[PDB]
Design an enzyme around this catalytic site. Structure first.
Site, PDB file in Angstrom:
ATOM      1  N   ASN A   4      17.617  19.290  -7.635  1.00  0.00           N
ATOM      2  CA  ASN A   4      16.869  18.035  -7.612  1.00  0.00           C
ATOM      3  C   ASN A   4      16.222  17.962  -8.995  1.00  0.00           C
ATOM      4  O   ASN A   4      15.296  18.713  -9.289  1.00  0.00           O
ATOM      5  CB  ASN A   4      15.779  18.070  -6.539  1.00  0.00           C
ATOM      6  CG  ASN A   4      15.048  16.747  -6.413  1.00  0.00           C
ATOM      7  OD1 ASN A   4      14.754  16.089  -7.415  1.00  0.00           O
ATOM      8  ND2 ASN A   4      14.742  16.353  -5.183  1.00  0.00           N
ATOM      9  N   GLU A  56      19.426  23.560 -11.836  1.00  0.00           N
ATOM     10  CA  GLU A  56      18.893  22.377 -11.176  1.00  0.00           C
ATOM     11  C   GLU A  56      19.659  21.917  -9.948  1.00  0.00           C
ATOM     12  O   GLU A  56      20.867  22.110  -9.845  1.00  0.00           O
ATOM     13  CB  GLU A  56      18.874  21.206 -12.165  1.00  0.00           C
ATOM     14  CG  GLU A  56      17.808  21.297 -13.230  1.00  0.00           C
ATOM     15  CD  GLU A  56      16.487  20.752 -12.747  1.00  0.00           C
ATOM     16  OE1 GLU A  56      16.224  20.840 -11.529  1.00  0.00           O
ATOM     17  OE2 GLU A  56      15.709  20.249 -13.585  1.00  0.00           O
ATOM     18  N   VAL A 100      12.220  17.407  -9.102  1.00  0.00           N
ATOM     19  CA  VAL A 100      11.305  18.349  -8.467  1.00  0.00           C
ATOM     20  C   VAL A 100      11.512  19.771  -8.972  1.00  0.00           C
ATOM     21  O   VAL A 100      12.642  20.233  -9.085  1.00  0.00           O
ATOM     22  CB  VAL A 100      11.492  18.347  -6.935  1.00  0.00           C
ATOM     23  CG1 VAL A 100      10.594  19.397  -6.296  1.00  0.00           C
ATOM     24  CG2 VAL A 100      11.181  16.967  -6.379  1.00  0.00           C
ATOM     25  N   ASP A 137      36.871  13.155 -26.560  1.00  0.00           N
ATOM     26  CA  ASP A 137      35.488  13.052 -26.112  1.00  0.00           C
ATOM     27  C   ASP A 137      34.959  14.378 -25.569  1.00  0.00           C
ATOM     28  O   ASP A 137      34.678  14.512 -24.377  1.00  0.00           O
ATOM     29  CB  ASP A 137      35.390  11.956 -25.047  1.00  0.00           C
ATOM     30  CG  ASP A 137      33.961  11.551 -24.749  1.00  0.00           C
ATOM     31  OD1 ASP A 137      33.066  11.825 -25.578  1.00  0.00           O
ATOM     32  OD2 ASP A 137      33.737  10.937 -23.686  1.00  0.00           O
ATOM     33  N   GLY A 153      26.162   8.458 -16.071  1.00  0.00           N
ATOM     34  CA  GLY A 153      25.125   9.399 -15.689  1.00  0.00           C
ATOM     35  C   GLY A 153      25.792  10.717 -15.340  1.00  0.00           C
ATOM     36  O   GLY A 153      25.171  11.778 -15.395  1.00  0.00           O
ATOM     37  N   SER A 181      28.655  11.349 -16.865  1.00  0.00           N
ATOM     38  CA  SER A 181      29.308  11.585 -18.153  1.00  0.00           C
ATOM     39  C   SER A 181      28.974  12.950 -18.751  1.00  0.00           C
ATOM     40  O   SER A 181      27.823  13.387 -18.722  1.00  0.00           O
ATOM     41  CB  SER A 181      28.909  10.484 -19.136  1.00  0.00           C
ATOM     42  OG  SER A 181      29.096   9.209 -18.550  1.00  0.00           O
ATOM     43  N   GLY A 182      29.994  13.613 -19.297  1.00  0.00           N
ATOM     44  CA  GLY A 182      29.805  14.922 -19.898  1.00  0.00           C
ATOM     45  C   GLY A 182      29.896  16.054 -18.891  1.00  0.00           C
ATOM     46  O   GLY A 182      30.032  17.221 -19.268  1.00  0.00           O
ATOM     47  N   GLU A 213      14.880  26.507 -12.275  1.00  0.00           N
ATOM     48  CA  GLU A 213      15.215  25.888 -13.553  1.00  0.00           C
ATOM     49  C   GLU A 213      14.909  26.694 -14.811  1.00  0.00           C
ATOM     50  O   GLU A 213      13.972  27.494 -14.857  1.00  0.00           O
ATOM     51  CB  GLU A 213      14.521  24.526 -13.675  1.00  0.00           C
ATOM     52  CG  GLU A 213      14.785  23.580 -12.519  1.00  0.00           C
ATOM     53  CD  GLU A 213      13.758  23.709 -11.415  1.00  0.00           C
ATOM     54  OE1 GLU A 213      13.104  24.770 -11.325  1.00  0.00           O
ATOM     55  OE2 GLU A 213      13.612  22.747 -10.630  1.00  0.00           O
ATOM     56  N   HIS A 236      30.432  11.469 -26.614  1.00  0.00           N
ATOM     57  CA  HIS A 236      29.656  10.233 -26.650  1.00  0.00           C
ATOM     58  C   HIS A 236      28.228  10.439 -26.157  1.00  0.00           C
ATOM     59  O   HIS A 236      27.403   9.535 -26.239  1.00  0.00           O
ATOM     60  CB  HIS A 236      30.356   9.087 -25.883  1.00  0.00           C
ATOM     61  CG  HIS A 236      30.251   9.167 -24.389  1.00  0.00           C
ATOM     62  ND1 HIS A 236      31.202   9.785 -23.605  1.00  0.00           N
ATOM     63  CD2 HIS A 236      29.340   8.646 -23.533  1.00  0.00           C
ATOM     64  CE1 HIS A 236      30.884   9.638 -22.331  1.00  0.00           C
ATOM     65  NE2 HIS A 236      29.759   8.950 -22.259  1.00  0.00           N
TER      66      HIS A 236
END
Ligand SMILES: [Ca+2]
Length: 220
Positions: free
Chosen positions: A54, A52, A57, A84, A174, A176-177, A62, A40
């Site tokens: 934060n 990551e 920032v 899903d 948020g 999710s996944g 990253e 979804h």
């Protein structure tokens, strides 16, 4: 993540952030070229952000990599969120290091009672928990019986519940996944639930252990 604690920086090196302007879903790196997420969360193209802690920032750890292919499970249904799960291929291989490491796929389906870790940058529903920093939470896998009892006739073979029927601790939008790791293996993908951390409404996750064949075949 609701009712958890801030993860130690880089303690969940497989955790990725799917970005489309802003963070909108989590995901899990399973190898240098592929990321697993929820169907979804689909978008024709997405930017995968690895290493990551934060998300607002620059920490110097990253790696921002654009997707080359996004593949939803062929039987995904937006009507009930069945199957899903989704695979994202990186346009360029990720560089594995101290901040970026893949998580192993399940060798077997974890039984009820197994303790797992769920993490993400989703809603925290708290004034002290800063959602910009990766949040962590330990949740046990519930029996199918408890899961169906909470969501009658809504749980398919591709879903499992995890959390506490008492409420107060749970994943949320948020997240999710995102990953649900138990015994060092990816057992679940944050999918859905009624509200967040509400009593009697545990989190529902995609059952990764029954998708091994599709995952390995697709990643070929
Ligand atoms: Ca950062």
């Amino acid at each position: 993540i609701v009712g958890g604690y801030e993860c130690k920086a880089y303690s969940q090196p497989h955790q990725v952030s799917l970005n489309s302007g802003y963070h909108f879903c989590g995901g899990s790196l399973v190898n240098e070229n592929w990321v697993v997420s929820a169907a979804h969360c689909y978008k024709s193209r997405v930017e995968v952000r690895l290493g990551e802690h934060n998300i607002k920032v620059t920490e110097g750890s990253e790696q921002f990599i654009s997707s080359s292919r996004v593949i939803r499970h062929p039987n995904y249904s937006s009507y009930n969120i069945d199957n899903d799960i989704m695979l994202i291929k990186l346009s360029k291989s990720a560089t594995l290091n101290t901040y970026v490491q893949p998580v192993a796929l399940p060798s077997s389906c974890a039984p009820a009672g197994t303790m797992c870790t769920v993490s993400g940058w989703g809603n925290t529903m708290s004034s002290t928990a800063d959602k910009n920093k990766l949040q962590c939470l330990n949740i046990p896998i519930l029996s199918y019986s408890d899961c169906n009892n909470s969501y009658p006739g809504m749980i398919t073979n591709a879903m499992f519940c995890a959390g506490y029927l008492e409420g107060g601790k749970d994943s949320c939008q948020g997240d999710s996944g995102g990953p649900v790791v138990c015994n060092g293996e990816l057992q679940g993908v944050v999918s859905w639930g009624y509200g967040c951390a509400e009593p009697g409404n545990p989190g529902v996750y995609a059952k990764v252990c029954i998708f091994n064949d599709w995952l390995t075949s697709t990643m070929a």
